[model samples]
Target chain A: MTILVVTGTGTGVGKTVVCAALASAARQAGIDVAVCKPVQTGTARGDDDLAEVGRLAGVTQLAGLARYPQPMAPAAAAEHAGMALPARDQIVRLIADLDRPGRLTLVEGAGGLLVELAEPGVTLRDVAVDVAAAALVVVTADLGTLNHTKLTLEALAAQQVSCAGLVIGSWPDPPGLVAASNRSALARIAMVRAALPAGAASLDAGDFAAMSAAAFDRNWVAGLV
Target chain B: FQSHMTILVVTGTGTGVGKTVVCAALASAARQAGIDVAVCKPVQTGTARGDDDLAEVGRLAGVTQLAGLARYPQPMAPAAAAEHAGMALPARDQIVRLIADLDRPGRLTLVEGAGGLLVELAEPGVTLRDVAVDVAAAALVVVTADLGTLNHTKLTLEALAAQQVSCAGLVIGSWPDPPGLVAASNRSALARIAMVRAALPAGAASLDAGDFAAMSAAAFDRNWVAGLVG
Candidate 1:
């Protein structure tokens, strides 16, 4: 059972988009895949993003460990709503339960890799480590990505979590210098699995599922993992 | 109040675009100008040794006192490092304490951030924007040596504008010389924004000279150091 945990350097950098794409790719390869978000805050609806991912991955069954309507950090949101967010143990148990035999689980994190979930401590990276899944860092292909991506990698290394590869997202048809340079530099610095183009809204589940099964070289992933 | 006391917040289009180097150079220039300056990194992550960028800046700036390494070590975002270490991410209360402890009435404060304006600090919703806004100080965004910086800088300014944060100016750091496109076109783009003050040339020396040299205060034009004295 391969668990792919998707994270990004910052919010709105395409965490869900990449996760949906990967799930779709996996499904195309005839791999039975499932998706879960350990916690979601700041959104009014709980199942919207998950439902979208489900439709994209061709799987309607989705579960969320914790959901909050306040548009803030989990702790802040929970505090605003006068409630406590899920505990780290609860999240770990959820991931473990979803890690059923022979099923590929794709866990999407909230916000950036270090977004806080509960109180002054407890961040998304801690949750990812608890799950013990290989990380797929999603970075936007733009200026300043070099520093952000490298720092993110350094943080991941500090956490003792192995990076599977980087998935570079959001580049137009004619790739610019920043995108092109980041692609090359990231390849030189670390193993980049794929450089995906912008406008992935058109891609469906079958495409992603297929890509997941074959696009990611398992040997390369094994070496990193 | 010390007339020479200046606190410059070094932000960026995104993380790792040479904010540390720029901050270091700013601190170094402050020392050169015969001002006693101090450097404070409110949060940091990702190393056991105290040899990160802020530490290097402390060396360059010639200040013996460097602050906030204990609160951040993992280079994960500030909140993330706190979580991973089983500690409380510094909140507004803690930040108040840090600033009060380090902020001398007459000393310059250079507060550098970890990532872009809206980079998540705690969760998808909590961003560097919140921290910057809460500080109630002006900001300087560091751009990269590329073309998309125009868009990125504009986006950052827009975010700041939405928050009603006063942007001191824009600092185009990193490149030895400003490209024609960035200088000619990017400057014009920033000029369209209402509160944008100026755009310094890349590198810390240029930024210091631009801030201290007493130039025009118009958008993209280097301003006098007096202009920075709020």
Candidate 2:
């Protein structure tokens, strides 16, 4: 019943890829994995993340509690739709069914960690605390990412949530001084745990799983799950 | 680094979000109120480039009372930029003292942070948030009018809440002429958190000083300055 929550430092930081990467690694490591997105706001585009995960990692249990048409934060989309989002307890109930020590449940958060899943604001922070899940934050590896990463890491730290370390959402091929130093600095601060290649999402299914396994330390997921 | 009778720290979610233009608008609006305004750039990166940040602020807002702490050649985060140039980094205490020295009766000092709120301006991991918390300054977050901004803006707001730094409001760097559904709904969503102080129309930056100031004055609320400016 070990669950790990995945969130991004900002939108388009390769969050879905990171989730699939973690799940891919776990499946290869001989662990039963299930990925759940509590509330997805851009379902008008169709169910793509789970489909990709299924192709890459064979995790078909990629269920979501709610969906919205607008491609923005769940709260904003839910507000636009003029509807009330499910309560924290409702999401907790969904997670409870999958909660166990042996099975690994990776809860993917919308946008960033602070994005309210619903109004009056219940963020992934609440969900993580409710489920006693460790956080694995995905971050960008660009110039502006330092502050975003630092701010997100501090937010998680302030809550005293057990961190599973940071993951580079897209590691560039020809790294410059900024990207290179940022990588070094984040790793030195123990914020970076692993980095997926920039085109990780578009990789072939079998190659993605192999790359996912190589991307993260087997020992890390072994301890996490 | 100096403080005004009142001080406002301007930061953004990321680079090129119209932070400089937003500062120009604030400066212009505050100046139109007949208040003496000063702008301090904590550190300037890409100084080797043609255009300067405060230079544009000084030009558009008619701001002459401006100072910058350090300059780096590279166009990136101050720390990374400073590292390549072998320049001494600005320290938190140094900036704190600079702001203290900058503050006086009857003037407003707007400290503009480089890159984003969390980008390390000085060595030892000092960010704009650190400087704001140290001086108890209100922050003016310059955000974009896009779908990606809500998450960044919200995370930045949460960080400010953690430090007990007051958020004066949010400024949309540039508002498109014909905004779409996403832009409209995004503004509505952010309006829930705090005031969307002003939305500078597109091309406000390219206008002449008089034209820019006039546009800025019309776009910004005078009450914001009337409430803060002594």
Candidate 3:
């Protein structure tokens, strides 16, 4: 199974929602898929992002290897909990173990790509590069997204990791002035392969899966998956 | 704005991050230190008919170097704003010409960007990071102290790093008093990446010029601003 690491420009940029759509689409394509969140920050057992993804995608093979209580990046949250994080290798191994020959394993990163996970300075990018996985970055479309998108893509390039085009999380139906202007400019910088509807998170499971399946066409996602 | 040898480009994670106020406080602090300071917006997207960003900076800071190359009526990115208003964008070379004309020997002028560091200022895909690197000017990122700041700040930093640009540091455009858990947590983590130059207090815009300058000076480390132009 090939692994894809999903990241975002920042928190609340909709990485989780995009992952949900991706998994839903992949399953609809007759591909066996499983989701993994490397580190879940700021949530306990009762609430988390994977549950949301599972609810929307109907994929139960989800793994959250390690977690911290603080609602911040993994590094700071670990510090707040006064917990010794598992070594970087151990976490990477957990993700590697999730891989199987015919399944598509999608790994979700916490917050941004650079925020430390499991260790003081280990980022999701590090794990992706080490494991030779393609990183799919989810971004917002507004006044600030251009810079963040360009920077995050460039950061991936700097790490020698391949970028599987950008996904505009929560794309408005009738995009505003800023969003409309950003559409062409963002496409010029990097391919904007797909954009989920503005309110993909609020849809019921039936509606969510149908819309998610429609968001990605088979050929557009061929290169990465 | 007159020519200034030392120019610092003030940019933010995005709009509504109190970028203009941070520019005001920084100029006020610089003036209080006996440094002749000025603020210039390269492009003002949302002029609001009678109000502009530079005017607000002059009103709040009282330094009064308010001028820029272009202004658009629509409240959007420069390219889209220009499109909505049906006007030509200031070309890349045109912008460089303005910065060259605005450069002076002994003055420290602050060039405030329209939106974020990478928001299109003129043509397709051009950003403040482009102008700063071309002019070799220092850039200061104004960020918020909320949950998403760490990622935004790091993204800006990575862009600056990619271009080998000299980053001055980070400033909190609107810092909550008695910092909350998320703000306080990010403050420490973000400081590890770049210097937390100063945390501008909330409601700084409401204060009088004199008090704002004093508080601005108290807010920032004096040594931080000194090193930029020194």
The most accurate candidate by TM-score is: 2
Which model is ahead, 1 or 3, in terms of DockQ? 3
- The C-alpha RMSD in Å for every predicted model, in order, reads 14.7, 2.3, 2.5
- Residues A168-217 of candidate 1 have per-residue lDDT tens digits of 75555798544665576668657776655566646675665554455455
lDDT of 2 by residue, B1-230 (tens): 23347878999987678989998888888888887888988788988775488888987888998887788888877877788888888888889887878777778789999988888877788889889988878999999878678778977898888889999999999889898878887888778878999999988889997889789889977887766764
How close to the true structure is residue A139 of candidate 3, measured as C-alpha lDDT? 83
lDDT of 2 by residue, A1-225 (tens): 588889887778888889899898988888889888888877787745666667878897777778788787777778788887878888877887887666889888886787777445788987888788889988887878778777777777878778889999899898777789889877866657788998988888898998999998998877776
Docking class of 1: incorrect
Q: Between candidates 1 and 3, which one is better according to lDDT?
A: 3
DockQ of 1: 0.05
Say which candidate scores most in lDDT. 2
Pick the winner on lDDT between candidates 1 and 2.
2
Candidate 2 stretches with Cα past 4 Å from truth are: B1-4
For model 2, what is the error of residue B2's alpha carbon versus the real structure, in angstroms, after optimal superposition?
16
Listed in order, each prediction's TM-score against the native is 0.53, 0.95, 0.93
Q: Tell me the deviation in Å of residue A54 in model 2.
A: 1.2
Worst 10 residues of 3 chain A by lDDT: A216-225
Which residue pairs overlap in candidate 2's backbone? A1-A100, A1-A101, A1-A102, B1-B98, B2-B102, B3-B102, B3-B103, B5-B107
> Once model 3 is optimally superposed onto the true structure by TM-score, how far is the C-alpha of residue B181 displaced, in angstroms?
1.5
